[PDB]
Design a protein around this nucleic acid. Sequence first.
RNA 1: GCUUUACUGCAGGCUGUCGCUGAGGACUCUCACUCCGGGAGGAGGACACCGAUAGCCGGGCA
RNA 2: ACUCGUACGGUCACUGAAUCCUGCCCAGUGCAGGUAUCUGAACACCUCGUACAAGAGGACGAAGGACCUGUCAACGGCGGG
RNA 3: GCACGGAGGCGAAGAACCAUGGAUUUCCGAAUGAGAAUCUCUAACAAUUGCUUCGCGCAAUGAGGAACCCCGAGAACUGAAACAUCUCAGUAUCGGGAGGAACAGAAAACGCAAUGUGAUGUCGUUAGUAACCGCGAGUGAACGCGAUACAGCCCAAACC
Lengths: 119, 237, 46, 194
Amino acid sequence: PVYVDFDVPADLEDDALEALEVARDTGAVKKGTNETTKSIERGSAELVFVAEDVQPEEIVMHIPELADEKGVPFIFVEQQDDLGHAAGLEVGSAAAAVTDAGEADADVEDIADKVEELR
Amino acid sequence: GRRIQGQRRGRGTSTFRAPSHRYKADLEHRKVEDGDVIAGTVVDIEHDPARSAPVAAVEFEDGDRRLILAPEGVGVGDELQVGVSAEIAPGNTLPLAEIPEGVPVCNVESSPGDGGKFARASGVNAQLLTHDRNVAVVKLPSGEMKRLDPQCRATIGVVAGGGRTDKPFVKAGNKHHKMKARGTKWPNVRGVAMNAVDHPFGGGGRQHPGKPKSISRNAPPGRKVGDIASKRTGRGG
Amino acid sequence: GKKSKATKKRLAKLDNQNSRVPAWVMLKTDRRNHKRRHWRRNDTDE
Amino acid sequence: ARSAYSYIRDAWENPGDGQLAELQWQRQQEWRNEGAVERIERPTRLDKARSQGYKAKQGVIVARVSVRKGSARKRRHKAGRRSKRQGVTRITRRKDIQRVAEERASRTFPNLRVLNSYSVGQDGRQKWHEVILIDPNHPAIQNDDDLSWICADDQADRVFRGLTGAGRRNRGLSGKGKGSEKTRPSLRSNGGKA
RNA sequence: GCUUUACUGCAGGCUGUCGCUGAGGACUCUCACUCCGGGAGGAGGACACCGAUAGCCGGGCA
RNA sequence: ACUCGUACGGUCACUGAAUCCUGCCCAGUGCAGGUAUCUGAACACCUCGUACAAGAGGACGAAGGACCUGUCAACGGCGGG
RNA sequence: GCACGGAGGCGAAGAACCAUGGAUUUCCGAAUGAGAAUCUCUAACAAUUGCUUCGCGCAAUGAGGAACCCCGAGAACUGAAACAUCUCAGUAUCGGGAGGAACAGAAAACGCAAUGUGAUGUCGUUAGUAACCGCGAGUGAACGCGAUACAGCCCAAACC
Ligand SMILES: [Cl-]
Ligand SMILES: [Cl-]
Ligand SMILES: [Cl-]
Ligand SMILES: [K+]
Ligand SMILES: [Mg+2]
Ligand SMILES: [Mg+2]
Ligand SMILES: [Mg+2]
Ligand SMILES: [Mg+2]
Ligand SMILES: [Mg+2]
Ligand SMILES: [Mg+2]
Ligand SMILES: [Mg+2]
Ligand SMILES: [Mg+2]
Ligand SMILES: [Mg+2]
Ligand SMILES: [Mg+2]
Ligand SMILES: [Mg+2]
Ligand SMILES: [Mg+2]
Ligand SMILES: [Mg+2]
Ligand SMILES: [Mg+2]
Ligand SMILES: [Mg+2]
Ligand SMILES: [Mg+2]
Ligand SMILES: [Mg+2]
Ligand SMILES: [Mg+2]
Ligand code: NA
Ligand code: NA
Ligand code: NA
Ligand code: NA
Ligand code: NA
Ligand code: NA
Ligand code: NA
Ligand code: NA
Ligand code: NA
Ligand code: NA
Ligand code: NA
Ligand SMILES: [Sr+2]
Ligand SMILES: [Sr+2]
Ligand SMILES: [Sr+2]
Ligand SMILES: [Sr+2]
Ligand SMILES: [Sr+2]
Ligand SMILES: [Sr+2]
Ligand SMILES: [Sr+2]
Ligand SMILES: [Sr+2]
Ligand SMILES: [Sr+2]
Ligand SMILES: [Sr+2]
């Protein structure tokens, strides 16, 4: 909430997760806030996800600005466990990063676009 | 020395407590949603041990039986109203805003909904003077002009039992009985009649305070006795 | 007074202890009940 | 590259600036309505907790504790004392608030043992600290190579005997040389002059 | 043991200052915090309460 | 605690039923109010000093005091010539 | 049995006695289903916790112990020929807690200043020295050295 500067439509969040799900089956993805953070730092990330139900918020407060000064696009997910499921986890995930998509570059592209527009 | 009586009081031991287990009830106004659709019938007049004044037992429409702070002139059978739309007559309760200026009131709330704080003693009454949209000006029994939120509820009329103070107790025994119904240690032994160890005024060949009685507001408990922060004393001047 | 069942058991025990040292103990030890109590001269517990 | 953890750390170097400032302003409102000791599922300062020994494992518990701010709360002398032992107002206690907090937490969880604790802020009238406690009887811990040490009998009630990091510092045991003449090996053995 | 304008201190009260504490020498606001209200909501408001410190008073106490 | 209390209350003191009365004194002390000017601490601020700090000085000045006023059914006083 | 009686009994089916192990082990008692001056009333880990199959299912705590030990609270008589800083003294006493011993402990050390020592207790000494102090009365270390015993390791993070 303090790190969320815009609301994402339930339908946009739908496409993103699906894309992330196919991204793990095809391309490569990072699960976890630490791995996600390094991806953004190493610049090896195309799209990063950040749950909105993270408590304490400290764990993810840095993703937004870290991504901006790294050009990496990011999107918000409402549920923490959905991101973990979509990422192919038996648990939850506060943040995620699609390290090079996989047969979803067209979608990941559109998603990043629909966001920039959504400001 | 030893702690003075005023300090013994604060510990709240039996000797200084009020016979609460004997008290009837706290005459706080009823809580109404709105509409004023609340009316009851005076079912009986009773004695209130804690105030030496009468109180009225009321049965409300919705089945609630409660004692109420009774104004003068309220009798069994009479119908009382409590709400914004209540009628303007003795025994009824409604916010100051709905009350017409120049009408004597009692059991006035300090903060809207508290149940009444001002003018609750025998034969007293506050006088609603000025109205407004932001402030209701009331003249309390002490003569002080109090600014109240127009939303503060009150009861029309003066408190029952007036004149109670006009007759002397005549004898100690009567004071005694009254005191047994209050949170007060009585009778009273003068400070000057005690030993130096017991009070700032104790000691000395003959009785007399060995000091001026007007004491500073800043004096600590144990020393704050006599005439507290008096702006003046005596009758002259 | 009103004694409880337990108080009664204790009182009973004290009464029992108030007996004499059997005569045979005398012969055997070849020569006093130091805890001899009197209802009046003494005071029991409780 | 920088760990995500370093970001939590860096935020907490200035709890009064940035987003952290707003989080605290919001949080404390809720904290002020909670009890003296509240168990929490996750540390508010992850980096600090893991740094102190915390692990996301069975038998590891975290609880936030609040304590009234200020100096000592002492009763003035009823019997005669010389000016020196008449002091009442400016005299403070010998245990810091963090230590008091660690003990309350441990009393709440009689079966757990204090591992460490850290500050999570304060307002004008109270201070908050989170405490990491461990279940010495849970096998997930009896088998942990990094925590099984706290299962030993001599580790029972360690916080009440000053065996905590906060305990050791408060006992003036930080320095190994100058200044620790009367603190090591114990305050008591040195006649209580440290 | 008791007294006081004995000595020296200690509670306590008043007062300034710093923290709690925010936004736009006099001011507005609301979001902390306080109070009233069963609740909605109302009143107050960066004050007050509380922590720290400074000056004054200080046989109430040692 | 007072307090299921709210100035026709209850707290703190003095005098001590009724009756007839209760004079003069506010300089000292006490309490309270006011206060142009004077005095009045710490933090912040300014000058000097220190590559910093100790420290010296300055400006501002709250309560309090100086000063003024009210007050004796307030402590008390009501003499010598 | 102490305990030297009377009566009677047990023991070669090896008693008594002793060692080890086991059985029985009323009620109150931390005392734990609720209550109670050792008893009573109608199935019990009461209470706080952890795990959890979310069910008291599996577990922990509670109280004791001569002192010793660790962490907190902390006097006064007394000395100074009075007394306030100081002293008595971090003593007496109080609160909490562990063990068979505690505590300490592998340097952001030491600073015989070095081309030197090398975790920590403790003992001897260093020394009534340095330092404190109405610079009064009094208080009072450390490094080092000689001994005792010796022992060094594990995380957090980086990268996965
Ligand atoms: Cl009266
Ligand atoms: Cl512990
Ligand atoms: Cl050396
Ligand atoms: K002394
Ligand atoms: Mg009432
Ligand atoms: Mg009485
Ligand atoms: Mg009298
Ligand atoms: Mg007398
Ligand atoms: Mg006195
Ligand atoms: Mg007299
Ligand atoms: Mg007289
Ligand atoms: Mg018999
Ligand atoms: Mg030792
Ligand atoms: Mg309230
Ligand atoms: Mg004295
Ligand atoms: Mg008389
Ligand atoms: Mg039982
Ligand atoms: Mg002496
Ligand atoms: Mg001398
Ligand atoms: Mg000493
Ligand atoms: Mg040294
Ligand atoms: Mg390892
Ligand atoms: Na007897
Ligand atoms: Na514990
Ligand atoms: Na005496
Ligand atoms: Na005068
Ligand atoms: Na047995
Ligand atoms: Na148990
Ligand atoms: Na259970
Ligand atoms: Na002497
Ligand atoms: Na003497
Ligand atoms: Na001295
Ligand atoms: Na040498
Ligand atoms: Sr989870
Ligand atoms: Sr009331
Ligand atoms: Sr009420
Ligand atoms: Sr006197
Ligand atoms: Sr007069
Ligand atoms: Sr007798
Ligand atoms: Sr224990
Ligand atoms: Sr008279
Ligand atoms: Sr005067
Ligand atoms: Sr060695």
